[PDB]
Paper text:
LASV has a surface-displayed class-I trimeric [name] spike complex that mediates receptor recognition and fusion of the viral and host-cell membranes at acidic pH. The spike complex consists of three copies of a single polypeptide chain that is cleaved twice to give a structured signal peptide, a receptor-binding module ([name]), and a trans-membrane module (GP2). We previously showed that a triad of histidines on [name] is important for binding [name], and we further demonstrated that the binding of [name] triggers the spike of LASV to catalyze membrane fusion by potentiating its response to pH.
Similarly to GP1LCMV-Fc, GP1MORV-Fc did not pull down [name] from HEK293T cells, nor did it interact with recombinant [name] immobilized on a sensor chip. We obtained crystals of GP1MORV (residues 73 to 235) at pH 4.0. GP1MORV has a central β–sheet made of five β-strands, flanked by the domain termini on one side and helices and loops on the other. The histidine triad in GP1MORV (His91, His92, and His228 according to GPCMORV numbering) adopts the same conformation as the triad in GP1LASV. GPCMORV has a β-hairpin made of two β-strands (β5 & β6) stabilized by a disulfide bridge (D3) against α3. This β-hairpin is divergent in sequence and was previously termed the variable region of GP1LASV. GP1LASV has a strong positive charge in the vicinity of the triad, whereas this charge on the GP1MORV surface seems milder. Overall, the structure of GP1MORV does not reveal major global structural differences that could account to the inability to bind [name].
Author numbering: 80 to 235
């Protein structure tokens, strides 16, 4: 049994990239990845990670600033299906500002502005970008299907 993505305590949205498969982005306080690794030494896994993230950037038309910043992250695969977990650092205004030039923040600002969440707030405005503040501890991405997007798929 795995926890739900479509829950009252979470925010979620599903990107359909092709007829069958897509990405489910989930803001939650439950984590699915125990470790803190992102073993991408194989070229094929490193490219599936690039492609999941590219499909989010193009659909949301994200323009991520370069601030020499970095969001804590673990990743993992289950038979070619990626699971990416960001351990967010945006609980304060200072933390939101220091983790602003990241894919996580651009995603969250899309949730805030499409009203898919109420727990996202503005912090600092810089370079035409909004730094997002939130109490959510994780942002989860999984390569999944439309029929399963409401339940977290097994990561490994
Ligand atoms: C979701 O996962 C699949 C599997 O990793 C991704 O792509 C295809 O996977 C098959 C193996 O089942 C490979 O033989 C193909 O070469 C892969 N195609 C591509 C274009 O990479 C699929 O792209 C993933 N979807 C998302 C949205 O990340
Ligand atoms: C997530 O966890 C933080 C505590 O770290 C809490 O303040 C926040 O309200 C929680 N949000 C949800 C939706 O449970
Ligand atoms: C990356 O994953 C492979 C798969 O087993 C593993 O052998 C390798 O040691 C990992 N990378 C590092 C630096 O350990």
């Amino acid at each position: 049994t795995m926890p739900l993505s479509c829950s009252k305590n979470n925010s979620h949205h599903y990107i359909q990239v092709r007829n069958d498969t897509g990405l489910e982005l989930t803001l939650t306080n439950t984590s699915l990845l125990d470790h803190k690794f992102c073993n991408l030494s194989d070229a094929h896994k490193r490219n599936l990670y690039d492609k999941a993230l590219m499909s989010i950037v193009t659909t949301f038309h994200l323009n991520i600033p370069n601030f020499n910043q970095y969001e804590v992250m673990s990743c993992d695969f289950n038979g070619g299906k990626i699971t990416v977990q960001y351990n967010l650092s945006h609980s304060s205004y200072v933390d939101a500002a220091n983790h602003c030039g990241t894919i996580a923040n651009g995603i969250m600002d899309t949730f805030r502005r499409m009203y898919w969440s109420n727990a996202l707030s503005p912090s600092e405005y810089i370079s035409g970008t909004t730094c997002i503040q939130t109490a959510y501890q994780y942002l989860i991405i999984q390569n999944t299907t439309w029929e399963d997007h409401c339940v977290f798929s097994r990561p490994s």
